[PDB]
Amino acid sequence: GLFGKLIKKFGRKAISYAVKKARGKH
């Protein structure tokens, strides 16, 4: 899937930020 590539490109920074946000909004 394209998502896999996108994610590759980020280096799971999207996931990291998602988790960070969802364990620390502000």
Swiss-Prot record:
It is found in: Secreted. It comes from the Eukaryota. Expressed by the venom gland. Cleavage of the propeptide depends on the processing quadruplet motif (XXXR, with at least one of X being E). The mature peptide (59-84) forms alpha-helices which probably disrupt target cell membranes. Belongs to the cationic peptide 03 (latarcin) family. 02 subfamily. It has antimicrobial activity against Gram-positive bacteria (A.globiformis VKM Ac-1112 (MIC=0.7 uM), and B.subtilis VKM B-501 (MIC=0.4 uM)), Gram-negative bacteria (E.coli DH5-alpha (MIC=1.0 uM), E.coli MH1 (MIC=0.7 uM), and P.aeruginosa PAO1 (MIC=6.7 uM)), and yeasts (P.pastoris GS115 (MIC=6.7 uM), and S.cerevisiae Y190 (MIC=54 uM)). Also has a strong hemolytic activity against rabbit erythrocytes. Causes paralysis, but is not lethal when injected into insect (M.domestica) larvae. This is M-zodatoxin-Lt2a. The chain holds residues 59 to 84 of 84 of the full protein.
